[PDB]
Amino acid sequence: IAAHKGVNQAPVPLKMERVGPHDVHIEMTAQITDIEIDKGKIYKAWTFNGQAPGPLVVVNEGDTIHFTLKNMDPVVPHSMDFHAVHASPSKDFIDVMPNKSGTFTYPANKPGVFMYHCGTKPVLQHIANGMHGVIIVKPKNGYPTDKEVDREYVLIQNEWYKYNDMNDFQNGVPSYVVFSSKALKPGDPNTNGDTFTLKEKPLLAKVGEKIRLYINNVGPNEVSSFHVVGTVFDDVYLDGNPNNHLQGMQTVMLPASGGAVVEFTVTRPGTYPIVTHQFNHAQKGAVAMLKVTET
Amino acid sequence: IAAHKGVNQAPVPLKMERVGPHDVHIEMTAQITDIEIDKGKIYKAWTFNGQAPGPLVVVNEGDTIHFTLKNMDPVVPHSMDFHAVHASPSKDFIDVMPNKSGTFTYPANKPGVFMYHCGTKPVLQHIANGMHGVIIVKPKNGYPTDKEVDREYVLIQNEWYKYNDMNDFQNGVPSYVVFSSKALKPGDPNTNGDTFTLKEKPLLAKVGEKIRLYINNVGPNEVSSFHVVGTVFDDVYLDGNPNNHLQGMQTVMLPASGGAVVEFTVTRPGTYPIVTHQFNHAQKGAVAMLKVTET
Amino acid sequence: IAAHKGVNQAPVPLKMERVGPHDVHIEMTAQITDIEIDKGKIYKAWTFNGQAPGPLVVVNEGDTIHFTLKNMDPVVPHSMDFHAVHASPSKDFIDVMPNKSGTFTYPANKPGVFMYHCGTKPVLQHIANGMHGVIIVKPKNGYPTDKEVDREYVLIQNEWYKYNDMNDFQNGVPSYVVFSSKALKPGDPNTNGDTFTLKEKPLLAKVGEKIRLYINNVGPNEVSSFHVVGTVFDDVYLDGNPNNHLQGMQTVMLPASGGAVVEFTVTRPGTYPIVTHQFNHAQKGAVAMLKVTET
Ligand SMILES: [Cu+2]
Ligand SMILES: [Cu+2]
Ligand SMILES: [Cu+2]
Ligand SMILES: [Cu+2]
Ligand SMILES: [Cu+2]
Ligand SMILES: [Cu+2]
Ligand SMILES: [Cu+2]
Ligand SMILES: [Cu+2]
Ligand SMILES: [Cu+2]
Ligand SMILES: [Cu+2]
Ligand SMILES: [Cu+2]
Ligand SMILES: [Cu+2]
Ligand SMILES: [Cu+2]
Ligand SMILES: [Cu+2]
Ligand SMILES: [Cu+2]
């Protein structure tokens, strides 16, 4: 795209603030940002806030979101679809033109781990170029295993294709499949979808801890066979809904856009790979590490 | 196939009638019928009754089906496999020769949303050419949420490949992936698997309604990540069995041949896309619309 | 690989023995073995014990495994990752060099149907070449339907690609997709992953029996849509955990590495195909048969 040549917009922080007991304001940007998706490989991503996947949003069950999108793309319209909410797609998930803002309001009444993404036609193009992320809605009554969990992280799976190549997007295998982590608490890593960061800087934990992962596979096109090497999932809540309880799963099947909360114990010091067990995708980048130490 | 050149058999209505409290007669045809699968693209489908997917069949739990297949194909044998039933495949799902009929009898003792399809070797060929559909078996005791539902429809996902090209069927990506709807009550739309009909003539509903969809992904080859934009599934019954209850799912993973009953609320007027969230498939046709109005 | 040219190591039996109430010894080999994966097609597989998938291992919930791997490959290191166990991957699933042995110890505390496989980098290469199998961990308290089951078998799904071709493994469609069966009791068949054996020598059962299948899809890359033609699954336990109960499923979605226990009734004499309902994979070999007779 001629108007994107040489464009590399610096990442802008997510803006969020609570404005009442059941209402939150969220402002994001749509922006064009170079990301290093594999060593030596730059992708001029279409992004929320200069991150791909986008920034983590966390709200409470029953929160109404007042969402603003500031579109910094010089020439392409963008939009926002939160899977967490009940909304009219054709009134609430509409396009925001270049250099304009749009504000939209909708309720998040269901707990879980939801995908969000740009909803601009062709949606495959906006997603595949980088406009995806997760919103967590925390359950009013928690999860039944909350008292058991010692540490938590968020992981997101996505794919990368040939740059802005709609033929590749529709008909081709992914070039890369990757994990990222997004921060829940100060000090947590916050990364983009790449083949290397979570290998080189593993997630950290302590021997004997029960770990919770909020996970979502944003696609755009592949399903995920989510597995942590060296353990078994004690508890799995599908889409992060506390009712959809499974126990003792070795691997969790996630559809494209599918989420889960998964919990497992690390019993011994060492490094634990986290994979999709579709090993073609793992080989093309979708392996993260969890380093477990005596401290 | 030389004997199919210029053949376009008019659709024949499904024949069904109840012959006792727990017994139903169903007659279908196998027939060769031109279908417009995308704008300007005709596929000379192998079909049940001149529809692809085939006509909707609905029975009650505990019904014995007395099924007749009249084979109008001039040269290819066909057969019928209902996933709803307990039968001997090698006695009950056998071939019916060109210009002959065969009658078969078997019980449907499990509630759900089942695939049916031709069972003639090579089964991939008969399925991919169009010989697929759904049979719904209604549960004796209903679903626990029956009192909440205001409107219902049936949706079916299937793929189309290069015409009668076994190499493509086994090794290639789908050319099109599509939704159809089949009628449950008078006035409901009844359509074939194409890229456009349910965009141009959306399914209809009223603001505030709880909608039930009976869904099945007949394949032949792809899994489905079933999602309705702008809502969250309140309740999901996997394969349509009332026992397999999930709640608050953003997206439902269906295997090839997999079914579900899903329920959701539309809270605001507008148009709600219904997609598989494998966006390569959505881009190749698998987007339907639900138009929700104040009336 | 020059050092594998002309190498065809005879299969070696699995060695297992119980050494206390909650401790078992298992010795396996890593070895290079020609397998006939389709008629006329030999694959010089990388294997455990000269079988691909490898030998069946069955333990009890709460058993500690003392596992020995003797590496007979003249030049490639191998390792073992059991999904059943809690272990440190970086201490317990490490490489055993050519012509050496390694011993590792870890607990199997969760019941189910687990994948095992070589964990040597690149893991896709070791898996795709044949280093996969299943370990069953029997639940302390059984399954709730145990009293209903008349006969049981184990089935495993895997794929084959172009020989040792990492490009094909990562980016290409499978050449073959296949079932095998592994023996639970004397007289049960024990086969390798091929396109023909379980067609030519079907699994056997008696009219009216409730059949249990322990199943796992080891991949490396595909998901499975597991279906038995002519019946409906009465009960499904996901990953073989008794808590993850589903009922009346026509087809079970298995991720790559995913397992299940499934139970169904065969009501009439005949031959019942067992398929993945991704029919491209079925056409490329993934059809087994169950022959059901009056005796
Ligand atoms: Cu309040
Ligand atoms: Cu506000
Ligand atoms: Cu966009
Ligand atoms: Cu979406
Ligand atoms: Cu703890
Ligand atoms: Cu009666
Ligand atoms: Cu009759
Ligand atoms: Cu046919
Ligand atoms: Cu079938
Ligand atoms: Cu209502
Ligand atoms: Cu004891
Ligand atoms: Cu020992
Ligand atoms: Cu190996
Ligand atoms: Cu593994
Ligand atoms: Cu019995």
CATH number for A1-295 (one of 3.30.460.80, 2.60.40.420, 2.60.40.680, 3.40.1190.20): it is: 2.60.40.420
Cα–ligand 1 centroid distance for A26 (angstroms)? 20
CA distances (Å), origin A246, targets A235, B225, C15, C242, C272? 6, 20, 34, 10, 31
Cα–ligand 4 centroid distance for B287 (angstroms)? 12
Rounded Cα distance between C157 and C155, Å, is: 7
Cα–ligand 4 centroid distance for B110 (angstroms)? 33
Find all residues with CB under 8 Å of B112, minimum gap 6, and list them. B84, B136, B137, B239, B240, B241, B259, C232, C248, C250
What's the length of chain C? 295
Q: What are phi and psi of A219, to 5 degrees?
A: 80, -140
Q: Residues A26, A15: contact at Cβ < 8 Å?
A: yes
Rounded Cα distance between A72 and A11, Å, is: 11
* Residue that is written with structure tokens 């078996």 in the block: B137
Q: How do strand B252-254 and strand C252-254 relate by DSSP bridges?
A: unpaired
CA distances (Å), origin C187, targets B177, B264, C215? 46, 51, 19
Rounded Cα distance between C179 and B234, Å, is: 37
Domain boundaries, chain A: 1-295
Find all residues with CB under 8 Å of B77, minimum gap 6, and list them. B71, B95, B96, B97, B98, B120
CA distances (Å), origin C40, targets A182, C11, C34, C189? 51, 20, 12, 22
Q: Is A170 left (phi over 0), alpha (psi -120 to 50) or beta?
A: alpha
Find all residues with CB under 8 Å of C190, minimum gap 6, and list them. C51, C56, C181, C182, C183
Which chain C residue shows the shortest CA-CA distance from A293? C88
Tally of CA atoms within 13 A in the half-sphere of C226 that contains its CB: 30
C226–A contact, CB cutoff 8 A: no
Q: Residues B205, B266: contact at Cβ < 8 Å?
A: yes
A270–C contact, CB cutoff 8 A: yes
* Torsion over CA: A45, A47, A52, A53 (sign): negative
Residues of C in contact with A271 (CB under 8 A): 89-90
For C165-258, strand residue ranges (E) read 176-182, 203-206, 210-219, 224-228, 233-238, 245-249, 252-254
- H or E segment at A25? strand A23-38
Residues of A in contact with C222 (CB under 8 A): 278
- Say whether A168 counts as a known binding-site residue: no
Rounded Cα distance between C270 and B89, Å, is: 7
Rounded Cα distance between A81 and A133, Å, is: 10
Which chain C residue shows the shortest CA-CA distance from A249? C239
Cα–ligand 14 centroid distance for C90 (angstroms)? 14
A130–B contact, CB cutoff 8 A: no
Locate A276 and state its tokens: 């999709």
Which chain A residue shows the shortest CA-CA distance from C167? A280
Rounded Cα distance between C148 and C168, Å, is: 44
Burial of C69 (0-12, 13-18, 19+ CB in 10 A): buried
* Residue that is written with structure tokens 């014990």 in the block: C49
Rounded Cα distance between A27 and A66, Å, is: 8
Would the CB atoms of B280 and A92 count as touching at under 8 Å? no
Residues of A in contact with C94 (CB under 8 A): none
Q: What is the DSSP letter of A283?
A: H
Burial of A212 (0-12, 13-18, 19+ CB in 10 A): buried
Locate B103 and state its tokens: 């009658």
- H or E segment at A15? strand A15-20
Q: What is the DSSP letter of A51?
A: B
Rounded Cα distance between C205 and A185, Å, is: 57
List the single residue in B87, B110, B254 with the smallest CB-CB distance to C248: B110
List the single residue in C89, C123, C241 with the smallest CB-CB distance to A282: C123
Burial of A2 (0-12, 13-18, 19+ CB in 10 A): exposed
Rounded Cα distance between A190 and A55, Å, is: 9
Would the CB atoms of B170 and C247 count as touching at under 8 Å? no
Tally of CA atoms within 13 A in the half-sphere of B84 that contains its CB: 33
For B61-202, strand residue ranges (E) read 63-71, 81-82, 101-108, 112-117, 132-138, 151-160, 176-182
Which chain C residue shows the shortest CA-CA distance from B244? C246
B144–A contact, CB cutoff 8 A: no
- H or E segment at B265? strand B259-265
Q: Residues A231, C86: contact at Cβ < 8 Å?
A: yes
C184–B contact, CB cutoff 8 A: no
List the single residue in C253, C270, C276 with the smallest CB-CB distance to B88: C270
* Residue that is written with structure tokens 């020439």 in the block: A75
Q: Residues A157, A132: contact at Cβ < 8 Å?
A: no
Rounded Cα distance between B131 and B226, Å, is: 22
Residues of B in contact with C250 (CB under 8 A): 83-84, 112, 114-115, 239, 257-259
Locate A240 and state its tokens: 């992060």
Q: Please state whether the peptide bond connecting residue A186 to the residue before it is cis, i.e. omega within 30 degrees of 0.
A: no
| Cα B286-B11-B260 angle, rounded to 5 deg | 40
Chains that touch A (3 or more CB pairs under 8 A): B, C
CA of C66, nearest ligand number: 12
Instruction: Output the DSSP codes for A120-185.
Output: PSSHHHHHHTT-EEEEEEE-TT--TTGGG--EEEEEEEEEE-STT-HHHHHHS--SEEEEEEE-SS
Q: What is the DSSP letter of B91?
A: H
Find all residues with CB under 8 Å of C60, minimum gap 6, and list them. C22, C108, C137, C138, C140
Q: How do strand C41-48 and strand C203-206 relate by DSSP bridges?
A: unpaired
Q: Residues B211, B263: contact at Cβ < 8 Å?
A: yes
Rounded Cα distance between A77 and A95, Å, is: 6
Q: Give me the amino acid identity at B124.
A: L
C248–B contact, CB cutoff 8 A: yes
Which chain C residue shows the shortest CA-CA distance from A246? C244
A54–B contact, CB cutoff 8 A: no
CA distances (Å), origin A71, targets A79, A147, A214, B132? 9, 42, 28, 45
What's the gap in Å between the CA of C51 and the closest CA on chain A? 21
Q: Residues B99, B30: contact at Cβ < 8 Å?
A: no
A223–C contact, CB cutoff 8 A: yes
Q: Residues C69, C96: contact at Cβ < 8 Å?
A: yes
**Method in brief:** X-ray
Which chain B residue shows the shortest CA-CA distance from C281? B170
List the single residue in A238, A256, A259 with the smallest CB-CB distance to B278: A256
- H or E segment at C91? helix C89-92
